Amino acid sequence: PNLPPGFDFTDPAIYAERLPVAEFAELRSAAPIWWNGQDPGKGGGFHDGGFWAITKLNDVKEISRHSDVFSSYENGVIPRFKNDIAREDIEVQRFVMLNMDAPHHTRLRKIISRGFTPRAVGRLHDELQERAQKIAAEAAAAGSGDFVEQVSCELPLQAIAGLLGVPQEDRGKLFHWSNEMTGNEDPEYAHIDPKASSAELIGYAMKMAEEKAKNPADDIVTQLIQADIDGEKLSDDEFGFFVVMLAVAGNETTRNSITQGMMAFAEHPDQWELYKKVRPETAADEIVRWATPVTAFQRTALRDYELSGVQIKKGQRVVMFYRSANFDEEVFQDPFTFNILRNPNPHVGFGGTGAHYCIGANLARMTINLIFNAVADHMPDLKPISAPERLRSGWLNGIKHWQVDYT
């Protein structure tokens, strides 16, 4: 393929400036599964010499489905850390469900599903609606400011807090910890210590579990820590690792969908007009497809496997570029058209279907629909003041800041 020498699709230096859309498109055309070699010292924590770049949606689906072969546990699913991260700090990720394989994953996911039933998520609708409206009214009253801080940031965190029944008086500290827990190599956050924030949140969560045991109530936390028919339940530490996971799975992901959804609307005025008029809930999936907040997650081959004619060898990493897959010309009609009515919309923003498919997908969609209804209600004529500031990360597609005029 026509790419520069030394080009690495996980290079945070790229994402600090842009999404490598042309480069992904080149791979889908010329080399849809392509060895992305990595130079000595430049492995983002992985010292294996590179990985297979996976760029087509059907290949992402196949990997995701064949979790018996393609492991989350072996190397974790984050494909890029600081180049000099200790192996121990990669392996500690195995304490959360995202980086577990069956049978351990299977047990935990069955327990955790208690928190993500249609009924459980539905119970959050009304409070998240009220919150969304307030957030939007407060931003409008400010006149202008940072859209990320004023509009995108709070609702995802309030969704997590509502799900867990976190007391109001505890939400400030919970949000502070949660906003420091996703690693990046952005100079703006170089002083932050994810390890400390994570240890604090796990302490808080474990205390919550021990209290809920003594004082059972009708809520999600009680359901998680009380034995089901099979005696299955989260132990306190497992509850702690569940909360830590949510702090990093359900926070910057939804936040970035909201910011980039609004960026797409700013760029596509006809779609924004249509949105304001009919408020189509299909908008949430097109926003997730367009935003692809997780650019890539990886897996490791536990055995040799032939994927679309390419021999993947035992021990090798495959990196699923959801950002490429979501613009796959073979799956979508006019992928580079932003169409809030797209239906069906079989995007892989929430992963390929399979064992690890995003458990929060419907919570995320509801969050997105509620905040954009609020933005429509309170700031229908908002316009950007300056360009978004992107996050320096090799796997998260983030917007740090974006100045907008709500009037």
Nearer to ligand HEM, 337 or 353 (CB): 353
As measured in angstroms, the least distance from the Cβ of 15 to ligand HEM is: 16
The two three-digit tokens of residue 302, written as one number? 């536990």
The two three-digit tokens of residue 47, written as one number? 């010292």
Residue 245 touches ligand HEM, criterion: CB under 6 A: yes
Nearer to ligand HEM, 81 or 406 (CB): 81
Nearer to ligand HEM, 182 or 406 (CB): 182
Binding mask 262-291 for ligand HEM (x = CB under 6 A): --------------------------x---
Q: Is 153 annotated as a binding residue?
A: no
Burial classification of residue 70, based on how many CB atoms lie within 10 Å of its CB (0-12 exposed, 13-18 middle, 19 or more buried): buried
As measured in angstroms, the least distance from the Cβ of 220 to ligand HEM is: 11
As measured in angstroms, the least distance from the Cβ of 61 to ligand HEM is: 10
The two three-digit tokens of residue 288, written as one number? 């997730």
Q: Is 358 annotated as a binding residue?
A: yes
Residue of the chain from 111, 153, 224, 249 that contacts ligand HEM (CB under 6 A): 249
Residue 148 touches ligand HEM, criterion: CB under 6 A: no
As measured in angstroms, the least distance from the Cβ of 218 to ligand HEM is: 20
Residue of the chain from 160, 220, 319, 396 that contacts ligand HEM (CB under 6 A): 160
As measured in angstroms, the least distance from the Cβ of 256 to ligand HEM is: 7
Residue of the chain from 12, 43, 50, 250 that contacts ligand HEM (CB under 6 A): 250
Residue of the chain from 66, 107, 109, 134 that contacts ligand HEM (CB under 6 A): 109
Nearer to ligand HEM, 257 or 339 (CB): 257
Residue of the chain from 32, 293, 335, 394 that contacts ligand HEM (CB under 6 A): 293
Which residues, in sequence order, are bridge partners of residue 107?
none
As measured in angstroms, the least distance from the Cβ of 360 to ligand HEM is: 2
Residue 406 touches ligand HEM, criterion: CB under 6 A: no
Residue 157 touches ligand HEM, criterion: CB under 6 A: no
Parallel, antiparallel or unpaired: strands 50-54 and 317-321? parallel
Residue 234 touches ligand HEM, criterion: CB under 6 A: no
- By CB under 6 A, what part of segment 47-66 binds ligand HEM? 64
Burial classification of residue 103, based on how many CB atoms lie within 10 Å of its CB (0-12 exposed, 13-18 middle, 19 or more buried): exposed
Residue of the chain from 177, 272, 297, 305 that contacts ligand HEM (CB under 6 A): 297
Binding mask 182-211 for ligand HEM (x = CB under 6 A): ------------------------------
As measured in angstroms, the least distance from the Cβ of 260 to ligand HEM is: 10
What is the binding site for ligand HEM (CB under 6 A)? 64, 97-98, 109, 160, 245-246, 249-250, 253-254, 257, 288, 293-294, 297, 349-352, 354, 356-360, 363-364
Binding-site residue numbers for substrate are 183
